[PDB]
RNA sequence: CUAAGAAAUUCACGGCGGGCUUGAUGUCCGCGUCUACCUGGUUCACUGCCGUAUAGGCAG
């Protein structure tokens, strides 16, 4: 649905951009056994072929049921009351 | 416009016969190498996934 958020360009000391930033995008999910939910979306906005690089930042739109129905068990929570949600984003008409 | 501008060294050939280098010797004696660290950077193609032509069932 609409409820997609992007964070701004902050350096993260937990994720090295060396060998796994274009490999592990949906690998920790259970979509390879497919016992529960099966909806996941994979996208790549960034097609830039200059020199020895294709794709380096994260913007990958998943489904609508996965954040709402599959997350009845704690798997992505804990980071609830960190910041206040601001003005909402629109779904792009072009 | 250059101490400018020029240029054939060439032919031939037996180095070779012989030989005792020896004898002797104490290297010793002492010694604290230490402290720390993500190879989470691209560090050979190991027998059981239906056909280069853009075409086909990956509970790895």
UniProtKB/Swiss-Prot annotation:
Effect of residue 29 to K: Cleaves pre-crRNA 130-fold slower
Effect of inactivating the gene: Infection with phage DMS3 inhibits biofilm formation; disrupting this gene restores biofilm formation despite DMS3 infection. Normal biofilm formation in the absence of phage infection. Loss of production of crRNA in the presence or absence of phage. Disruption of the entire Y.pestis-subtype CRISPR region disrupts crRNA production but does not alter phage resistance (possibly OLNs PA14_33350 to PA14_33310, plus the flanking CRISPR loci), indicating this CRISPR is not involved in phage resistance.
Keyword Cell wall biogenesis/degradation tagged: no
Cofactor note: Metal-ion independent.
Keyword Hydrolase assigned: yes
E.C. numbers: 3.1.-.-
GO molecular function: endonuclease activity; RNA binding
Gene Ontology BP terms: defense response to virus; maintenance of CRISPR repeat elements
Active site: residue positions: 29 (proton acceptor)
Keywords: Antiviral defense, Endonuclease, Hydrolase, Nuclease, RNA-binding
Subunit (UniProt): Part of the Csy ribonucleoprotein complex with a probable stoichiometry of Csy1(1),Csy2(1),Csy3(6),Cas6/Csy4(1)-crRNA(1). A Csy3(6),Cas6/Csy4(1)-crRNA(1) subcomplex is also formed.
Family stated for the protein in its record: Belongs to the CRISPR-associated endoribonuclease Cas6 family. Cas6f/Csy4, subtype I-F/Ypest subfamily.
Function recorded in the entry: CRISPR (clustered regularly interspaced short palindromic repeat) is an adaptive immune system that provides protection against mobile genetic elements (viruses, transposable elements and conjugative plasmids). CRISPR clusters contain sequences complementary to antecedent mobile elements and target invading nucleic acids. CRISPR clusters are transcribed and processed into CRISPR RNA (crRNA). Processes pre-crRNA into individual crRNA units. Absolutely required for crRNA production or stability.
Note from the entry: In this bacteria, Y.pestis-subtype CRISPRs do not confer resistance to phage DMS3 or MP22, but instead are required for DMS3-dependent inhibition of biofilm formation and possibly motility.
UniProt name for this protein: CRISPR-associated endonuclease Cas6/Csy4
């Amino acid at each position: 649905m609409d409820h997609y958020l992007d964070i701004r360009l902050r350096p993260d000391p937990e994720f090295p951009p060396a060998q796994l930033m274009s490999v592990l995008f949906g690998k920790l999910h259970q979509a390879l056994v497919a016992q529960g939910g099966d909806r996941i979306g994979v996208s790549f906005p960034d097609l830039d072929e200059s020199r020895s690089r294709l794709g380096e930042r994260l913007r990958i739109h998943a489904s609508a049921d996965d954040l709402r129905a599959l997350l009845a068990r704690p798997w992505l929570e804990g980071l609830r009351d960190h910041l206040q949600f601001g003005e909402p984003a629109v779904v792009p008409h072009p």
